[PDB]
Design an enzyme around this catalytic site. Structure first.
Site, PDB file in Angstrom:
ATOM      1  N   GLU A  77      94.253 -35.665 129.297  1.00 43.98           N
ATOM      2  CA  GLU A  77      93.924 -35.139 127.977  1.00 43.98           C
ATOM      3  C   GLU A  77      94.975 -34.115 127.571  1.00 43.98           C
ATOM      4  O   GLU A  77      94.686 -32.952 127.281  1.00 43.98           O
ATOM      5  CB  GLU A  77      92.519 -34.534 127.970  1.00 43.98           C
ATOM      6  CG  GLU A  77      91.989 -34.143 126.595  1.00 43.98           C
ATOM      7  CD  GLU A  77      90.696 -33.343 126.666  1.00 43.98           C
ATOM      8  OE1 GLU A  77      90.055 -33.330 127.739  1.00 43.98           O
ATOM      9  OE2 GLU A  77      90.321 -32.727 125.644  1.00 43.98           O
ATOM     10  N   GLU A 130     102.427 -31.433 123.014  1.00 49.55           N
ATOM     11  CA  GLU A 130     102.219 -30.693 124.251  1.00 49.55           C
ATOM     12  C   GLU A 130     102.955 -31.322 125.423  1.00 49.55           C
ATOM     13  O   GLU A 130     102.699 -30.952 126.574  1.00 49.55           O
ATOM     14  CB  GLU A 130     100.728 -30.583 124.561  1.00 49.55           C
ATOM     15  CG  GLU A 130      99.962 -29.800 123.519  1.00 49.55           C
ATOM     16  CD  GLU A 130      98.497 -29.691 123.850  1.00 49.55           C
ATOM     17  OE1 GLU A 130      98.110 -30.143 124.948  1.00 49.55           O
ATOM     18  OE2 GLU A 130      97.737 -29.155 123.016  1.00 49.55           O
TER      19      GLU A 130
HETATM   20  C1  LIG Z   1      95.497 -24.095 118.104  1.00 53.05           C
HETATM   21  N1  LIG Z   1      95.327 -25.275 118.936  1.00 53.05           N
HETATM   22  N2  LIG Z   1      96.396 -25.980 119.391  1.00 53.05           N
HETATM   23  C2  LIG Z   1      95.874 -26.954 120.090  1.00 53.05           C
HETATM   24  C3  LIG Z   1      94.480 -26.904 120.097  1.00 53.05           C
HETATM   25  C4  LIG Z   1      93.595 -27.840 120.787  1.00 53.05           C
HETATM   26  C5  LIG Z   1      92.290 -28.062 120.339  1.00 53.05           C
HETATM   27  C6  LIG Z   1      91.420 -28.933 120.976  1.00 53.05           C
HETATM   28  C7  LIG Z   1      90.051 -29.029 120.302  1.00 53.05           C
HETATM   29  C8  LIG Z   1      88.892 -28.176 120.807  1.00 53.05           C
HETATM   30  C9  LIG Z   1      87.908 -28.118 119.629  1.00 53.05           C
HETATM   31  C10 LIG Z   1      88.812 -28.322 118.404  1.00 53.05           C
HETATM   32  O1  LIG Z   1      90.106 -28.793 118.883  1.00 53.05           O
HETATM   33  C11 LIG Z   1      91.855 -29.654 122.130  1.00 53.05           C
HETATM   34  C12 LIG Z   1      91.044 -30.606 122.895  1.00 53.05           C
HETATM   35  O2  LIG Z   1      89.879 -30.971 122.709  1.00 53.05           O
HETATM   36  N3  LIG Z   1      91.615 -31.214 123.988  1.00 53.05           N
HETATM   37  N4  LIG Z   1      92.895 -30.992 124.418  1.00 53.05           N
HETATM   38  C13 LIG Z   1      93.643 -30.159 123.775  1.00 53.05           C
HETATM   39  C14 LIG Z   1      95.056 -29.957 124.312  1.00 53.05           C
HETATM   40  N5  LIG Z   1      95.718 -31.160 124.982  1.00 53.05           N
HETATM   41  C15 LIG Z   1      93.179 -29.440 122.598  1.00 53.05           C
HETATM   42  C16 LIG Z   1      94.021 -28.536 121.914  1.00 53.05           C
HETATM   43  C17 LIG Z   1      94.139 -25.803 119.340  1.00 53.05           C
HETATM   44  C18 LIG Z   1      92.872 -25.201 118.968  1.00 53.05           C
HETATM   45  S1  LIG Z   1      92.258 -23.832 119.838  1.00 53.05           S
HETATM   46  C19 LIG Z   1      90.854 -23.748 118.830  1.00 53.05           C
HETATM   47  C20 LIG Z   1      89.807 -22.821 118.935  1.00 53.05           C
HETATM   48  C21 LIG Z   1      88.757 -22.898 118.041  1.00 53.05           C
HETATM   49  C22 LIG Z   1      88.747 -23.896 117.045  1.00 53.05           C
HETATM   50  C23 LIG Z   1      89.785 -24.808 116.950  1.00 53.05           C
HETATM   51  C24 LIG Z   1      90.868 -24.743 117.854  1.00 53.05           C
HETATM   52  C25 LIG Z   1      92.027 -25.562 117.944  1.00 53.05           C
HETATM   53  C26 LIG Z   1      92.289 -26.660 117.066  1.00 53.05           C
HETATM   54  N6  LIG Z   1      92.510 -27.539 116.371  1.00 53.05           N
HETATM   55  C1  LIG Z   2      92.885 -30.400 128.449  1.00 54.03           C
HETATM   56  S1  LIG Z   2      94.214 -29.272 127.961  1.00 54.03           S
HETATM   57  C2  LIG Z   2      95.518 -29.845 129.085  1.00 54.03           C
HETATM   58  C3  LIG Z   2      95.183 -29.496 130.526  1.00 54.03           C
HETATM   59  O1  LIG Z   2      96.124 -30.089 131.427  1.00 54.03           O
HETATM   60  C4  LIG Z   2      96.784 -29.125 132.189  1.00 54.03           C
HETATM   61  N1  LIG Z   2      98.165 -29.504 132.377  1.00 54.03           N
HETATM   62  C5  LIG Z   2      99.142 -29.565 131.422  1.00 54.03           C
HETATM   63  N2  LIG Z   2     100.299 -29.936 131.887  1.00 54.03           N
HETATM   64  C6  LIG Z   2     100.082 -30.131 133.224  1.00 54.03           C
HETATM   65  C7  LIG Z   2     100.926 -30.532 134.277  1.00 54.03           C
HETATM   66  N3  LIG Z   2     102.215 -30.819 134.104  1.00 54.03           N
HETATM   67  N4  LIG Z   2     100.397 -30.624 135.498  1.00 54.03           N
HETATM   68  C8  LIG Z   2      99.109 -30.335 135.670  1.00 54.03           C
HETATM   69  N5  LIG Z   2      98.223 -29.950 134.765  1.00 54.03           N
HETATM   70  C9  LIG Z   2      98.761 -29.864 133.551  1.00 54.03           C
HETATM   71  C10 LIG Z   2      96.618 -27.817 131.420  1.00 54.03           C
HETATM   72  O2  LIG Z   2      96.750 -26.759 132.323  1.00 54.03           O
HETATM   73  C11 LIG Z   2      95.222 -27.998 130.808  1.00 54.03           C
HETATM   74  O3  LIG Z   2      94.220 -27.699 131.743  1.00 54.03           O
END
Ligand SMILES: Cn1ncc(-c2cc([C@H]3CCCO3)c3c(=O)[nH]nc(CN)c3c2)c1-c1sc2ccccc2c1C#N
Ligand SMILES: CSC[C@H]1O[C@@H](n2cnc3c(N)ncnc32)[C@H](O)[C@@H]1O
Lengths: 302, 625
Positions: B423, B432
């Site tokens: 994820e 990312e």
């Molecule tokens: C600024 N940012 N960059 C990336 C992510 C983000 C957000 C989410 C979700 C959570 C709820 C709304 O999305 C996820 C996710 O669900 N999974 N993975 C990842 C990263 N790979 C992930 C990354 C966020 C965030 S911070 C946050 C806290 C409160 C409200 C909304 C958000 C939000 C968004 N959109």
């Molecule tokens: C669900 S948000 C992405 C998650 O994967 C982890 N992650 C991202 N990149 C790596 C990586 N290269 N190796 C292991 N975990 C990772 C982050 O620390 C976070 O918990």
């Protein structure tokens, strides 16, 4: 000190009109201070004005008085800041001024009002860009016209044609109206028009002043630079060959002849000159009021 | 609960008026601070020496009442753009006077009209006032949807109204506002008070005001209909606009006198409260994202940074997202382990980036409903989250799950995996570095192994939003490039904006990447047909991803996964707004660049005009490897 008359009159005098027998109608409103209202006054002694203790009648209104005009001999029609057009009528004793009707039909300040030839209808203009034809007997709006695209600065009923009237607006339009035509408005070919006045003895002739201080003579062109500010009003004298009284925001009054040439000039006022009215008894006396709370009696040389 | 105000041009007494207004149910009042007819001279005698007071006393209300209840109106006679010079001078002085008095009172907002094309001097005087002391007071520019000239009755015989469609002419009032706010350099204190006429214009005129800072909507009483009971209502077309405005949470202003004199004056207001209660209630997502609307956020970098505890807590609050994961694992287990081998075939699953173990639990749920055996590895480089995994692993999971505190690119796996689950996706899919992480982890995936997600794709769409452009513009920081805020993306719940074209796919990645010459750099050209006149402020980003076969996740609006909170859109701003005419094509270029240390995006607009290349060499924004 007549009954139901306020002890203090508002500072800013807005209108002054003589009637047949010679009594002077005064319309004033307070444009500053705590309360922003207006009042109506009747002075059977013109020289006693504007002293409140020696008037014939008086009454306070809810809002200011932007314009007024007589309706016959006992009727007063008022253009109010409240968006309403009011009609007040004197009693049989002419000691009280009672409200006849008050209808809130305009959406903004009613700036101008004028009674038509029949004496039973009137036309009003407002900053809501609308123009309304009223039935003074049924207390209802006959027609509502939105011909302009800006504030309606002045409306003037035709002296003898009951369906004709003039209107000007800050959209730089001068409109000749005839409610007998399917399209009742017609545009008459500068600087924004601010005051209209039909010629009393000539049907298709009127004069208008602009916001730059020019009075023009237009037929259905002659013009002169009379004032240095906006021309607030234009009134013709009741003479056979009439004069033209022009008052302006330059705090001066001018009297013109047939060819718009200056014959008299008064600077007695220290604030804006808001209205002028010719005495029916003495055709040479001219009364002007303004926001300096002055009621001046001019002796115009003829 | 609507925040409504009453517009008045006649106040006999403030104390009496304000009481009657509040008793009718209003929240504030628009009134003039000087008498509307009290013209004042500033240069020529004797009128300039008019004895005072020039207006009402400030003692007539409490400081709290001036701060929260009164909205000032500029006097209607003040015309700073009059063609008469004497009138310009007086208007400049009177405007400065009325504005300064409003500031003296601490009024929350001040109303100024836009009723003609040339408001240049009006803009200069206001701009000068703004650069005189730092204050928070707002300026509401009153601008009609339809110009008064274009709605006058066709009653002038020798000047008939236009009966042919003028597509750009019917947008003239927006050009008034656009030219005014551009002269004022997009001041955050200058907003729009849109005035709604009796006849609404075409749809493209209403869509013009999308993305504009609309703070108030002015509703004249003369546009209301009268139903059978005699109460004021609105036409279905006007109701449709009110619903659009309620989504913008504007304040509604009632102007004009009471024409339905058979009813009391709060009847107009009760109808607004009526329309407000009747609308689709918050649909979970809108209930969740409410509060984050148009709020700019830095995009998370979970590789370079270690996410905090409550960040993971938010990730785990989206059950629809993970049940999609559980289903994807469920379908994959059945396709790899036939029924006759369900007891002898143990599949090796590896969560790559396990966080606090929601995917681990989703895997355990999938293997149970599929009736297959799995051996789990939970890889997570965030050592603080590993503490949660190992307390989970000791207390519940047991020997079935093996926690590995390591980077997936360096971990020496003891065996190869049948399925890897990750994820690592951001709002722009790959922002990312999910491609780079899964590439390094590829070596311990079996030759027939499956990666979940299998592939993802990023999307872009040009947007118009003067509000969001202003918020980016307000992100200048003390010790960096004064324009660096325009050369970096923002995660934001997009709200007050206008999408100018359908989203188109940008970048695509596939996993496992069987190609021998792996290269995650990209360069993509897109051409967006724009069918309206507008101003281009930036590009919105979305993504789609394929977990397995038909099970997908998407934040792309037309294919949005229904009921999923996760992932707000991303915003790529541009330094300078770009005018776009109807029929023109917006052509944007995007690059995904990288070296051994960092990955970043560069982008440029090439049509109708050329912008500068944004974030060159990652000078303003890089994603850490
Ligand atoms: C600024 N940012 N960059 C990336 C992510 C983000 C957000 C989410 C979700 C959570 C709820 C709304 O999305 C996820 C996710 O669900 N999974 N993975 C990842 C990263 N790979 C992930 C990354 C966020 C965030 S911070 C946050 C806290 C409160 C409200 C909304 C958000 C939000 C968004 N959109
Ligand atoms: C669900 S948000 C992405 C998650 O994967 C982890 N992650 C991202 N990149 C790596 C990586 N290269 N190796 C292991 N975990 C990772 C982050 O620390 C976070 O918990």
């Amino acid at each position: 000190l007549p009954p139901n008359a306020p002890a203090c009159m508002e500072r800013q005098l807005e209108a002054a009109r003589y009637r047949s027998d010679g009594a002077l109608l005064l319309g004033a409103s307070s444009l500053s201070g705590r309360c922003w209202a207006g009042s109506l006054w009747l002075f059977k002694d013109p020289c006693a004005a504007p002293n409140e203790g020696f008037c014939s009648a008086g009454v306070q209104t809810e809002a200011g008085v932007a314009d007024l005009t007589w309706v016959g001999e006992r009727g007063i029609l008022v253009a109010s800041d409240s968006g309403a057009v009011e009609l007040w009528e004197l009693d049989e004793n002419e000691t009280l001024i009672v409200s006849k009707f008050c209808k809130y039909e305009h959406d903004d300040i009613v700036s101008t009002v004028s009674v038509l030839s029949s004496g039973t209808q009137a036309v009003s203009g407002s900053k809501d860009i609308c123009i309304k034809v009223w039935d003074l007997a049924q207390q209802v709006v006959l027609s509502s016209y939105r011909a302009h695209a800006a504030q309606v600065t002045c409306v003037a009923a035709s002296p003898h044609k009951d369906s004709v009237f003039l209107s000007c607006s800050e959209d730089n339009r001068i409109l000749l109206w005839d409610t007998r035509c399917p399209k009742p408005a017609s545009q008459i070919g500068g600087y924004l028009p601010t005051s209209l006045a039909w010629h009393p003895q000539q049907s298709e002739v009127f004069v208008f002043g602009d916001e730059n201080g020019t009075v023009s003579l237009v037929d259905t062109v002659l013009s002169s630079a009379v004032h240095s500010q906006c021309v607030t009003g234009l009134v013709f004298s009741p003479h056979s060959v009439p004069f033209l009284a022009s008052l302006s925001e330059d705090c001066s009054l001018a009297v013109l002849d047939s060819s718009l040439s200056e014959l008299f000039r008064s600077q007695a006022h220290r604030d804006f000159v808001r209205d002028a009215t010719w005495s029916p008894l003495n055709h040479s006396l001219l009364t002007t009021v303004g926001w300096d709370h002055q009621v001046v009696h001019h002796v115009v040389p003829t | 609960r609507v925040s409504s105000g009453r517009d008045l041009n006649c106040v006999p007494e403030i104390a009496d008026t304000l009481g009657a207004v509040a008793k009718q149910g209003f929240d504030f009042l628009c009134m003039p601070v000087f008498h509307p007819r009290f013209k004042r001279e500033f240069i020529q005698e004797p009128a300039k020496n008019r004895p005072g007071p020039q207006t009402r006393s400030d003692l007539l209300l409490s400081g709290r009442d001036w701060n929260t209840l009164i909205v000032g109106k500029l006097s209607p006679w003040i015309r700073p753009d009059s063609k008469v010079e004497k009138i310009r001078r007086n208007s400049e002085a009177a405007m400065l006077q009325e504005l300064n008095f409003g500031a003296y009172l601490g009024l929350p907002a001040f109303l100024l009209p836009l009723n003609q094309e040339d408001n240049t001097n009006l803009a200069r005087v206001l701009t000068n006032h703004i650069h005189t002391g730092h204050h928070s007071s707002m300026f509401w520019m009153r601008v009609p949807l339809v110009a008064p000239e274009d709605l006058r009755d066709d009653i002038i015989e020798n000047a008939p109204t236009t009966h042919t469609e003028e597509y750009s002419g019917e947008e003239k009032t927006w050009m008034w506002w656009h030219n005014f706010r551009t002269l004022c350099d997009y001041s955050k204190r200058i907003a729009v008070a849109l005035e709604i006429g009796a006849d609404l214009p075409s749809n493209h005129v209403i869509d013009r005001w999308l993305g504009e800072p609309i703070k108030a909507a002015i509703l004249p009483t003369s546009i209301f209909l009268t139903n059978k009971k005699g109460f004021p209502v609105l036409s279905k077309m006007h109701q449709r606009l009110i619903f659009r405005l309620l989504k913008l949470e504007v304040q509604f202003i009632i102007t004009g006198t009471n024409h339905h004199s058979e009813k009391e004056f709060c009847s107009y207001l009760q109808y607004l409260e009526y329309l407000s209660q009747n609308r689709p209630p918050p649909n979970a997502y809108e209930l969740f994202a409410k509060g984050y609307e148009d709020y700019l956020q830095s995009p998370l970098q979970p590789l370079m940074d270690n996410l905090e505890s409550q960040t993971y807590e938010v990730f785990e609050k989206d059950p629809i997202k993970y049940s999609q994961y559980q289903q994807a694992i469920y379908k994959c287990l059945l396709d790899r382990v036939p029924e006759e081998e369900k007891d002898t075939n143990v599949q090796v699953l590896m969560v790559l980036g396990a966080g606090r173990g929601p995917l681990v639990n989703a895997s355990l749920r999938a293997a149970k409903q599929a009736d297959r055996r799995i051996k789990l590895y939970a890889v997570e480089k965030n050592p603080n989250a590993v503490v949660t995994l190992e307390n989970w692993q000791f207390e519940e999971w047991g020997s079935q799950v093996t926690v590995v505190s390591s980077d997936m690119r360096e971990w020496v796996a003891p065996e190869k995996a049948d399925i890897i689950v990750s994820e690592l996706l951001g709002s722009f899919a790959d922002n990312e570095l999910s491609p780079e992480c899964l590439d390094g982890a590829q070596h311990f995936l079996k030759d027939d192994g499956v990666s979940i997600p299998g592939e993802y794709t990023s999307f872009l769409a040009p947007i118009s939003s003067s509000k969001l452009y202003n918020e980016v513009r307000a992100c200048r920081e003390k010790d960096r490039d004064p324009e660096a805020q325009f050369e970096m993306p923002y995660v934001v719940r997009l709200h007050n904006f206008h999408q100018l074209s359908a989203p188109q796919p940008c970048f695509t990645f596939s996993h496992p990447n069987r190609d021998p010459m792996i290269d995650n750099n990209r360069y993509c050209t897109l051409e967006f047909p724009v069918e309206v006149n507008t101003v281009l402020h930036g590009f919105a980003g979305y993504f789609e991803t394929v977990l397995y076969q038909d099970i997908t996740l998407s934040i792309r609006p037309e294919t949005h996964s229904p009921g999923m909170f996760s992932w707000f859109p991303i915003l790529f701003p541009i330094k300078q707004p770009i005018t776009v005419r109807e029929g023109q094509t917006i052509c944007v270029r995007f690059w995904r660049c990288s070296n051994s240390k960092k990955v970043w995006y560069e982008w440029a607009v090439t049509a109708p005009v050329c912008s500068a290349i944004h974030n060159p060499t990652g000078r303003s924004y890089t994603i850490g490897l």
